[PDB]
Amino acid sequence: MSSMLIWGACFGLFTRAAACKASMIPLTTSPWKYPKYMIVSAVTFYYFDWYRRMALEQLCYNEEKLERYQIRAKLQSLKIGEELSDAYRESFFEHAVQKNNI
Amino acid sequence: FFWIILLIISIIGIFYIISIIFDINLFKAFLAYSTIINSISFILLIIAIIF
Amino acid sequence: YDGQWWSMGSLACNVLFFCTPLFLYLILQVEELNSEKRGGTSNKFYHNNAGFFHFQIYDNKQ
Amino acid sequence: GVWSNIHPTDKVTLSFANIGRPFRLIYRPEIFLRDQQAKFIQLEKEHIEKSKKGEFVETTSPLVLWN
Amino acid sequence: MSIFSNIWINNDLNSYGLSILLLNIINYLIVFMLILSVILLTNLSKFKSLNQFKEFNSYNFILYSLIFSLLSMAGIPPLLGFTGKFLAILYSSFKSQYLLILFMTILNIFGMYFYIQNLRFVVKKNKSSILNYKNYYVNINYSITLNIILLNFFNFFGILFLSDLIIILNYISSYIYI
Amino acid sequence: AFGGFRQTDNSLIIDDRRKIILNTRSLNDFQQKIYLRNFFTNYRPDLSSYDYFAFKEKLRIGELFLNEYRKRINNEVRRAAILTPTSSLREKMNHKIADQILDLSSPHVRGAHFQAVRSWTDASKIVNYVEEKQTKINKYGLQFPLLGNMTEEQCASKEDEVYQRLLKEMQKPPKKA
Amino acid sequence: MELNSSAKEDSHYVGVLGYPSQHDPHTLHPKKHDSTFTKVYACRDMLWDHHWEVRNTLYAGFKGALLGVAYASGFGLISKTVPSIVLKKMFRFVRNNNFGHIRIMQDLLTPYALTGFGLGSVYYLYQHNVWENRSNKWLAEVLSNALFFQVATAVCVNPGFHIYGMVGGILFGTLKYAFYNSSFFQEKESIGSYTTFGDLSEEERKKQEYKDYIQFLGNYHKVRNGQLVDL
Amino acid sequence: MFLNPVKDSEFDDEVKGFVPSEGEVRFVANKNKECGYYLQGIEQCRRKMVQLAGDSSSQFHSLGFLPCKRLVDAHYRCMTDDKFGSTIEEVPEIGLDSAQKFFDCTFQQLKPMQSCRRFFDQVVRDVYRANGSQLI
Amino acid sequence: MEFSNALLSQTKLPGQQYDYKRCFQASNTHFECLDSIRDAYDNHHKCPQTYQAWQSSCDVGIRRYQMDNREQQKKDQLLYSKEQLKNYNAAKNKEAYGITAPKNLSFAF
Amino acid sequence: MSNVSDAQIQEWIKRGEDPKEFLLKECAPQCTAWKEKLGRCEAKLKSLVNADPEMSCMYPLRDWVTCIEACVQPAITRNLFGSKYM
Amino acid sequence: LFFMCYELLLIPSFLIVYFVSPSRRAIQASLYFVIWTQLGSLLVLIAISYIISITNTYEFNDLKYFNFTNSESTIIIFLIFLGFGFKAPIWPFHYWLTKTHVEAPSGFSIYLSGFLVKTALYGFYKFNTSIFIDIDSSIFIAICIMGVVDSSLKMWGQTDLKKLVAYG
Amino acid sequence: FIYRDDIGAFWGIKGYEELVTEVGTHKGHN
Ligand SMILES: CCCCCCCCCCCCCCCCCC(=O)OC[C@H](COP(=O)([O-])OCC(O)COP(=O)([O-])OC[C@@H](COC(=O)CCCCCCCCCCCCCCCCC)OC(=O)CCCCCCCCCCCCCCCCC)OC(=O)CCCCCCCCCCCCCCCCC
Ligand SMILES: CCCCCCCCCCCCCCCCCC(=O)OC[C@H](COP(=O)([O-])OCC(O)COP(=O)([O-])OC[C@@H](COC(=O)CCCCCCCCCCCCCCCCC)OC(=O)CCCCCCCCCCCCCCCCC)OC(=O)CCCCCCCCCCCCCCCCC
Ligand SMILES: CCCCCCCCCCCCCCCCCC(=O)OC[C@H](COP(=O)([O-])OCC(O)COP(=O)([O-])OC[C@@H](COC(=O)CCCCCCCCCCCCCCCCC)OC(=O)CCCCCCCCCCCCCCCCC)OC(=O)CCCCCCCCCCCCCCCCC
Ligand SMILES: CCCCCCCCCCCCCCCCCC(=O)OC[C@H](COP(=O)([O-])OCC(O)COP(=O)([O-])OC[C@@H](COC(=O)CCCCCCCCCCCCCCCCC)OC(=O)CCCCCCCCCCCCCCCCC)OC(=O)CCCCCCCCCCCCCCCCC
Ligand SMILES: CCCCCCCCCCCCCCCCCC(=O)OC[C@H](COP(=O)([O-])OCC(O)COP(=O)([O-])OC[C@@H](COC(=O)CCCCCCCCCCCCCCCCC)OC(=O)CCCCCCCCCCCCCCCCC)OC(=O)CCCCCCCCCCCCCCCCC
Ligand SMILES: CCCCCCCCCCCCCCCCCC(=O)OC[C@H](COP(=O)([O-])OCC[N+](C)(C)C)OC(=O)CCCCCCCCCCCCCCCCC
Ligand SMILES: CCCCCCCCCCCCCCCCCC(=O)OC[C@H](COP(=O)([O-])OCC[N+](C)(C)C)OC(=O)CCCCCCCCCCCCCCCCC
Fold first, then answer.
1. Are K75 and K63 in contact (CB under 8 A)?
2. How far apart are CA A4 and CA C4, in angstroms?
3. How many domains does chain J have?
4. How far is CA B49 from the centre of its chain?
5. Distance CA H122, CA H98 (A)
6. Is position J85 within any domain?
7. By C-alpha distance, which of F96, F38, E29, H51 is closest to J8?
8. Which ligand is nearest to the CA of A50?
9. d(C-alpha F41, C-alpha K66), whole Å
C-alpha cells in the first residue's frame, strides 16, 4: 500500500512460503527464517525506495547539464557552411562570443 | 564509417543463422546460439542508437 | 514432388482458385469505380467521429 | 500506492509510453517549462514595464506566458 | 531540437538508447541466470542434447521454472524479455528506423520459434530423475531454489517495477556526455 | 510532448507566411507539425472538442430523423392502402405523398447503407435542421422527460416561461395575408 | 560514406550555402588554338558525361561483372567441386604453359563475369527505362526488385527458388529505398535548418518566431490539458 | 449556434440555419489551433485570480480579473492576426455585442470555457464575415 | 565525446597538474567581487586584479566549468525562490499519490 | 472522407495568384555556375572594344535560363488543377 | 494498458492447450498457435511503437489533436490489420486455428473460438477508429472475402466435425 | 555518335541553338 517496510515484510513472508513449497518441505520448517526474511526484505526494499528517489533527483539535475551539451553539440554538428547561415549565425555568435567569458 | 559495417555484419549474420539455429541438436549449441541471437539483436539496437 | 499441386486435379480449376483473390480485388475496384462516379458508399475508413467511440462514457473528475 | 507514489501515472505506462522524453519533462514539468521560458520571462517583464510607460513594443507582444 | 528566437528547446533525452541497451543486457543476464540456476540445481550430466529437455520433466517447480524461463527468453509478452524487446522496438521507432525494426522483428520471430520448439521436447513419457543423490536421498538445494524463486518473481512481474529500473539505468547513463 | 517521424522525401517546402524555405527530409518535430499533419480530419475542425461531440451527436440524430421520416411516410402509404380501395388509390397517391416518397430516396436518407456520404456542408445543414427542430421543441418545453433532463426547479421555471410564451402568442393578433 | 550521393542532393541548399554542386557540368572545353593532341585528349569528358545511356549501361555491366568475379573468388569457386581429372589436366596445362594460371582464372571466371555483366546491364536498363518516373518510389523499388530478383533466381540459380528470389528482392528493395535513395546516415543538412527570403525585418522575424513558440507550447500534453500545478 | 432568426416570423421565436464559408471554417480552425494556449491560460488565470482574491476582505479584491486582461488581449490579437486593433476594447462594432456576451459568459456568469469559447469564436466569425478578404 | 566540454577538460598533458587550493581561493575571491558588483552579465573587467589572479591560478577548463555553473545559478536565482520551490515540490509530491484522469470534451485547441 | 473535409491551406494557385515570380528567385541559387559564367561573358564582352557581331551574351544566358526553368516549371505544373497531384 | 491486456491472453491459453489437451498432437498444435499468434502480436507491437514514439500520449484521446501523415497512417493500418487478423483468423493465416481446434481440449476450443478471437476484433476497431486513415480498404475487404470463400468451399471436404466447426 | 549536351543541340539535332528547348522534356519533366 504505502509502507515500503510492510510491503517488504509481506514480500519476505511470501518468498519464504514459496521457497518451502518449491523445496516440498512443510511450510513450518525452519520457522526462524520467516522473521529473518521479513526483516531483510523490508530493509532492502526501503533502501531501494530511497535510492530510486535519490537517483531520480540526481538524474533530473544531470539533465540540466545534458541540455547544455545538446545545445553546444548541435552547433558543432552543423555541416560546413551552416554555422554562418541565417538559421544558425546568431546562435553560433552567441555561443562563440557571449559565452566566451573565461 | 561504423554504421555501414555494422549494418552489413548484422544482415549477413541474420541471414546466415536463420537456417543454422534450426540445425543444432545439442544443449551447449542451444545456449551458444541464444547468446549469438541476443548479440545480433543488441548490434541492431546499437545501430539504432548511433543513428 | 515440387509442382504437383498445379497438376493434381484439374489445372484450370486450380488456377482459377489460385487467382480468386485477384478476381475479388478487381471486382471490388470496379464496384468502387461505380461508387466514385455515382456518389454512394466507397471503400474507405470513414472518420465521422473524431475518435469518439460508440456510446463511450466521457466524463471528468474533480 | 507506494511503488507508484512517485508519479500519478502507472509504472508500466511510465516505463513504455515515455520514450526519449526528459525525466525533467515527465516529473516536475512546470520547472522544465519555466527554464525553457527563462528569457521570455524577462522579455515579458520588459514589455509590461514599457506598456505601463508610454512606449508600446509589438515585437514581444505574443509573449504572454502563464506556465 | 527547436529554435525560437535563439532559444533552444530539447524534448529528446540523448542518454536513452544506452539505457535501453543496458536494460536489455541486464534482462538477458537475469533470464540466463535463472535458466542456469535451474540447470545447476539438477544433475548436469543428464542434459547433453535438445532431446534431453525432457529430463527437465521433474516436479512442478523445476518443470514450470524451465517453461517460463524458455518463454521469457523467447519474448512472450508478460515475461521479462518482452520488456527489453519492446523497449528496443520503441527506441527504434523513436529513431525512425523502419528497416531496422523489420530486421529486428524477423530475428525476434525466428529466435522465438527457436526457443519455443524445445517445449515440444520437454514432454516426457514419465517423470525424470535428475537430482544428485546424497546420504541415499536426492539433494535439493534450498538456497538455489530460493534464488530461482526470486528470479521467477522478477521474471513474472518485471513490467510492474520496470519504471524504477529504467530510471536507475537512465540516471547511470546520464553521466555519459554523449 | 508530441513528436515526429523522420522524413525521407527530398522535396522543398515554401512557407510564404513566415518567408522561409525548408526541405521535407530536414523537418524537425515542430516543423513537421506546422507544415505536415495540419490537414483536417473532421467535418467541423473549427469547433472545440465538446462542440464537435455535440455536432456528431446531432448529425447522428439527424440521420435517424430522416430515416424516421422515411419510415413514417411508408407507414402512411400502408395506411392509405388499407383504408382506400385500389380504385382511386393511385389517383390519391399521385399527390404530396408520392412526391415525398421520391424525395426521401436513398441519396437524401440513409436507409440501410453503412455510411451516408455527406459533405461537411451537408453535415452542417443536417445539424442545423436538427437544431431548428430542437429550438422549436424547447420553445414550449416538450423535451423534459424525452430528449432532456432537468431538476424540479428547472421544470417549474420552464413551465412558467412556457405559460408566459403561450399567453403572449395567444394575445398576438392573426398574421395578415 | 554515402551511397548515391549525387542523386540525393539539395541543389537549392548547396547553392545558398555556396557549397560546390555535384550537378556542375564537369566538362572540358579545349581552345580552338590548342594542339591537335590536346583537342583529341579533351574528348575524355565524354567518359564523365552522365546523360550517356550506353556509358551508364556499360558502367552497370562492369559493376555486375566485378561483383560476379568477387563472388566467384570468395564463395562460388571454393564451394563448387571440380573433377579430379579436370584438375589434373589444368595443372598439366599450367606446367606446360607460361602464365597458365591467368588462362585458368579467365576460364573459371568467364561464367560469373558474363552473368554479372548481363545482370547489371539488364538491371540498369530495367530501372532506368521503367520505374524511373513512378509516383510511389518505395513501392516502385519494391516491385521492380521483387520481379527482377524473382526472374534472376529462377534463371541463374534454380526455377524452384523463385519465391525465395522474390522475397529477397522485396527485402533488397526496402533496403535500397532506406539507404540508397534516402539519406539516413548521409545527412548533409542540419535538422530544422531553413533559408530566409524576402525583406523582413529582424523584429518581424522575432515576432513570428514568438508566435511559433506559442503555438509549439500546445504540443505539450500538460499545458494543452491544463494539468499543471501552480508553481 | 450557426442559426439566424427569422425576421418575419409568425411566432415570437423562429430560427433558420446557415453554413459558414469554407474560408471562415479554415480560418477559425487554424486560429484556434494556433492560439489554444491563450484560452487555457485564460481559464487557469481566472481560477487563480478567484482563489487569490475571491474573499471580499482580500486586499486585491478591487482588482479582480485585471491580470486576465493581458491574456484576453493576446488571445484576441492571435485570433485576429494582430489586425483590427491590439486590444479587445478595440473590437469592431460588428463584433462588439459578441465580445460583451463573451465577457459576461467568462467573468460575470463564470460559465464554462466550453460555453465562452462559443462567444469568442462568434466574435472572430463576425469579424471574418465583415471583412472577408482582409483576413483570409 | 568530441563535443563534451567536461571530457575535453578532463583531458590533460602528461605532466600537467592543478593546484586546486590556489585556484579555488582565487575563484572565490573573484566571484565574491563579482557578486558584490551584482550585475546581470559578469563583466570581469570591473575586477581587474582579482580577474588576473583567477586567470593565473585556475586552468581554462576549470574556468569554463565555473562560468557555466555561475550562468546556471544566475538563471535559477532569477527564476525561482526557496519557499516557492518548497511549496511546489510539496504540492507535486501530494499530487503524485492521486491519478491523472483524462479531460474529455475539452474546450481549447 | 478524403476530399470531403475542408482544406487546411490554400496555395498561390489555389488563390489565383502566380507563384513563378518568387519561384524564380527560389530556384536561382542552385543555377549559380551558369549565372557566374554568364556574368563573366558579359564582363568580357563589355571590355571588348572591337567585338565580332557573332559574339553575344546569349548562349550562356540560354543555358542559365534552361537550368532555372527545368526546376521552376515542374514545381508549378504539379500544383495545377487537371493533373494528377504529386 | 490496452495493448498489454491484449497480449496477456497468450500464456494461459498456451498452458491450457499444452497441459490439458488429451491428444498427443496438441504438443505441436500449441507451438503452431504460439508462433502464428505471436507474429501478429509483433505486428501490433510495431504499430503501437509507431503510435507511441511519434505521439508520446497514452490517454487514447489525445490522438484527436495529432494527425499522422499518409505514409505513417498506411503503415499503421496495414500492421494493425495483419496483426489482428493473425489472431482473428483470416486467409491465409488460419492453419494454426485449424490445428489448435482439432488438437485442443474440447472444453478449451469452445472458449478459444467463442472469445479469444474477438479481442483482436475489438482492438482493431479501437485503433482504426482512433486513427484517421486515407487509404482504400479494397485490399482488406478482398482478403476478408477470400477467407470467407475459402472456408465455405472447404467446408464440404471435412469429415471431422470439430474441423468443420473450425472452418465455420 | 556522341552529341555534346551543352552545345545547345539536343541529342545531336543541330539548330534551334538560340532557343530554350530542353525545358520540360530533357531538363525538367512537366
Ligand atoms: C482474357 C479474355 C477472356 C474473355 C474472352 C472469352 C473467354 C476466353 C477464355 C479462354 C477459352 C479458350 C482456352 C481454354 C483452354 C482450356 C483451358 C486450359 O488451357 O487448361 C488446360 C486444359 C484443362 O486441363 P485440366 O483441367 O487440367 O484437365 C481436366 C480433364 O478434362 C478432366 O476434367 P473432368 O472430366 O474432371 O472435368 C473438369 C472440367 C469441368 O469442371 C467443372 O465442371 C468445374 C467448374 C470448372 C470451371 C468452369 C468455368 C466457369 C466459368 C469461368 C469464369 C472465370 C471468371 C474469372 C476469370 C476472368 C478472366 C477474364 O474442368 C474444366 O473446366 C477443365 C476444362 C478447361 C477449363 C474450362 C473452364 C475455364 C476456362 C477459362 C474461362 C475464362 C472465361 C473468361 C471470361 C469470363 C466472363 C467475363 O487441358 C487440356 O487441354 C485438356 C482438354 C480439356 C478440355 C478443353 C476444352 C476446349 C477448350 C478450347 C480449346 C481451344 C483454345 C484456343 C486458345 C487460343 C489462344 C488464345
Ligand atoms: C506461496 C505463495 C503465495 C502467493 C500469494 C499471492 C501474493 C502475491 C505473490 C507474491 C509471491 C512472492 C514470491 C514468489 C513466488 C512465485 C514464484 C515461484 O517460483 O514460486 C514457486 C512457488 C512454489 O512452486 P510451485 O508452485 O511448485 O511451482 C509453480 C510455478 O510457479 C508455476 O506457477 P503458476 O503457473 O501458478 O505461476 C503463475 C503463472 C501465471 O500467473 C498469473 O497469470 C497471475 C495472475 C494474477 C491475477 C491478477 C491478474 C490481473 C490481470 C489484469 C490485467 C492487467 C494489465 C496491466 C498492464 C501490464 C500487464 C500486466 O505465471 C505468471 O505469473 C506469469 C504471468 C504473469 C502475468 C502478469 C500479471 C500482472 C498483474 C499485476 C497484478 C494486478 C492487480 C490489480 C488489482 C489491484 C489494484 C490496486 O509457487 C507457488 O507457490 C505458486 C506461485 C504462483 C504465482 C503466485 C501469484 C499469483 C497471484 C497474484 C495475486 C496478486 C497480483 C500480482 C501482483 C503481486 C505483487 C507484485
Ligand atoms: C524489473 C526487473 C528487475 C530485475 C531484478 C534482477 C535481480 C533479481 C534477483 C536477485 C536480486 C537480489 C536478491 C538478494 C541477493 C541474493 C541472496 C539473498 O539475499 O538471499 C539469500 C538469503 C537466504 O538466507 P537463508 O535462507 O536464511 O540462509 C542462506 C544461507 O544459509 C546463509 O547465507 P550466507 O551466510 O551464505 O549469506 C547471507 C548473506 C548473503 O548475501 C549476499 O552475499 C548477497 C549476494 C548478492 C550480492 C549483490 C547484490 C546487489 C544488490 C544491488 C542491486 C542489484 C541486484 C543484482 C542481482 C543480479 C546480479 C547478477 O545474506 C545477506 O546479507 C543478504 C543481503 C541482500 C541485500 C544486498 C544489498 C547490497 C547492495 C549493494 C549496492 C548498494 C547501492 C550502492 C549505490 C552506489 C552509489 C554511488 O536470503 C535472505 O536472507 C532473504 C531471502 C528473502 C528475501 C530476499 C529479498 C531480496 C530483495 C531483492 C531486491 C532487488 C533490488 C530491488 C528491485 C530492483 C528492480 C525494481
Ligand atoms: C605485391 C605482393 C605480391 C608480390 C608477388 C608474389 C610474392 C609474394 C607472395 C606472398 C603473398 C601471397 C601469395 C599467395 C599466392 C596464391 C596462389 C598463387 O597464385 O601463387 C601460386 C603460384 C603457383 O606456384 P607454383 O605451383 O610453385 O608455380 C607453378 C608455375 O611455376 C607458376 O607460374 P605461372 O605462370 O603459372 O603463375 C604466374 C602467376 C603470377 O603471375 C604472373 O606471371 C605475373 C603477373 C603480372 C601482372 C600482369 C597484369 C598486368 C600488370 C600491369 C601493371 C601496371 C598497370 C599500370 C596502370 C596504369 C593506369 C593509368 O600468375 C597468377 O598468379 C595469375 C594471376 C596474374 C595476373 C594478375 C592480373 C591482375 C589484374 C587484372 C585486372 C582485371 C582484368 C580484366 C580483363 C582485362 C582484359 C584486357 O606461384 C607462383 O607462380 C609464384 C607466386 C606469384 C603470386 C602472384 C599473386 C598474384 C598477384 C599478381 C600481381 C597483381 C598486380 C595488381 C596490380 C596491377 C593491375 C593491373
Ligand atoms: C526474361 C526477361 C529478361 C531477360 C534478361 C536477359 C536478356 C538477354 C539479352 C537479350 C536477348 C534477346 C533475345 C534472344 C533470345 C534470348 C533467350 C534465349 O535464347 O533463350 C533460349 C530459348 C531460345 O533459344 P533457341 O530455342 O535456341 O532459339 C532462339 C532463336 O535463336 C532466337 O533468335 P531469332 O533469330 O528467332 O531472333 C530472336 C529475336 C526475338 O526478339 C524478341 O522477340 C525480343 C523482344 C520481345 C521480348 C521482350 C521482353 C519481354 C517483355 C514482357 C515482360 C512481361 C513480364 C510480366 C511480369 C508480370 C508479373 C509476374 O531476338 C533477337 O535475336 C534480337 C537480338 C537483338 C540484340 C539485343 C541486345 C541485347 C543486349 C544485352 C545482351 C545480354 C548478354 C548477357 C546475357 C546473359 C546473362 C544474363 O529461349 C528461352 O528458353 C526463353 C524462355 C522464356 C520463358 C518461357 C516462354 C514460354 C512460356 C511462357 C512463360 C511466361 C512467363 C512471363 C513472365 C513471368 C510471369 C509470371
Ligand atoms: C511488542 C511486540 C510483541 C510481539 C510478540 C510476538 C508475536 C508473535 C506472533 C506469532 C504468530 C504466529 C502465527 C502462526 C499461524 C500458524 C497457522 C497454521 O497453523 O498454519 C499452518 C500452515 C500449514 O503448514 P503445513 O505445511 O504444516 O501444513 C499442514 C497441513 N497438512 C497436514 C495438510 C500438510 O502453514 C502456515 O501457515 C505456517 C507457516 C507460516 C507462518 C507465518 C507466520 C507469520 C508471522 C508474522 C508475525 C509478524 C509480527 C509483526 C510485529 C511488528 C512489531 C512492530
Ligand atoms: C515488408 C513489406 C512487404 C511488401 C510486399 C510487396 C508485395 C510485392 C508484390 C510483387 C508482385 C510481382 C511484381 C509486380 C510488378 C508490376 C507492378 C505494377 O504494375 O504496378 C506498378 C504501378 C505503379 O504505381 P504508381 O507508383 O504509379 O502509383 C502508386 C499509387 N499509390 C500511391 C496509390 C500506391 O502500381 C500499380 O498500379 C499497382 C500497385 C499495387 C501492386 C499490384 C501488383 C499486381 C501483381 C499482379 C499483376 C498481374 C498482371 C496480369 C496477369 C494476371 C495473371 C494472368
1. no
2. 68
3. 1
4. 17
5. 6
6. no
7. F38
8. 3
9. 10
Q: Report the CATH number that the domain containing residue J36 is assigned in CATH.
A: 1.10.287.20
Which residue is closest in CA terms to ligand 4's atom 35?
G99
C-alpha to C-alpha distance for G51 and L5, rounded to whole angstroms: 8
Across the G:K interface, residue pairs with CB atoms under 8 Å apart total 6
Q: What one-character DSSP code corresponds to residue K55?
A: B
Round to whole Å and give the CA distance between F40 and C50.
11
Instruction: List CB contacts of G102: < 8 A, sequence separation 6 or more.
Output: none
Written as one letter, the residue type at D29 is P
Residue in chain G nearest K59 by alpha carbon: G221
| Of G1, G127, G123, G113, nearest in space to G67 by CA | G113
**Residue whose CA lies nearest to ligand 4 atom number 24:** G101
Count interface pairs D-F at CB distance under 8 A.
3
Closest chain G residue to B8, measured at CA: G175
Residue J25 domain flag: yes
CA G87 – CA G72 distance, rounded (Å)? 17
Is J71 within a domain? Answer: yes
From the list I65, I53, I61, the residue with the least C-alpha distance to I28 is I53
HSE-up of G128 (CA within 13 Å, CB side)? 14
Report how far residue K161's alpha carbon sits from residue B8's, in angstroms, rounded to the nearest whole number.
51
Name residue F126's amino acid: I
CB D14 within 8 A of CB D7: yes
Reference H29, options J80, C51, F120, K54; nearest CA is: F120
Coil, helix or strand for F12? strand
Q: Which 2-21 residues of chain J touch chain K by CB within 8 A?
A: 2
Buried/exposed code over G112-146 (b: 16+ C-beta within 10 A; e: otherwise)? bbebbbbbbbbbbebbeeebeeeeeebebbbbbbb
What are phi and psi for residue F23, nearest 5 degrees? -120, 140
Measured between alpha carbons, how far is H2 from F47 in angstroms, rounded to an integer? 11
- Angle (nearest 5°) at CA E142 between E137 and E146: 150
* Pairwise CA distance, residues K111 & K16, whole Å: 11
In the block, residue with C-alpha cell 537456417:
B19
Q: Is the CB of A26 under 6 A from ligand 6?
A: yes
Is A89 touching I (CB cutoff 8 A)? no
Closest Cβ–Cβ partner in G1, G175, G179 for B1: G1
Interface probe with I: pick from G223, G225, G228, most Cβ of I within 10 Å? G225
Which residues of chain D make contact with G218, given a CB cutoff of 8 A?
A: none
R_g of chain D computed on alpha carbons:
18
CA angle G103, G106, G110 (to 5 degrees): 150
**For residues H8 and H125, is the Cβ–Cβ distance under 8 A?**
no
Whether J70 is covered by a domain: the verdict is yes
Its domain, for residue J42, covers 13-79
Q: Looking at the CA of G177, which ligand is closest?
A: 7
Q: Is C10 in the pocket of ligand 1 (CB under 6 A)?
A: yes
Residue E137: phi and psi, rounded to 5, are -135, 155
DSSP string, D12-31: HHHHHH--S--HHHHS-HHH
> From atom 44 of ligand 4, which residue's Cα is the shortest distance away?
G99
Q: Give yes or no for G1 touching B (CB within 8 A).
A: yes
DSSP secondary structure, A14-73, as one string: HHHHHHHHHHT--TTSSTTHHHHHHHHHHHHHHHHHHHHHHHHHHHHHHHHHHHHHHHHH
Q: Which protein residue's CA is at the shortest distance from atom 16 of ligand 7?
A: G143
Question: What is the distance in A from the centroid of ligand 4 to the CA of G119?
Answer: 28
Resolution (A): 2.9
Q: Please answer whether residues G189 and F22 qualify as being in contact, where contact means their C-beta atoms are separated by less than 8 angstroms.
A: no
Q: Quick check: L28 and J59 CB within 8 A?
A: no
Chain F residues in contact with H13 (beta carbon < 8 A): 135, 139
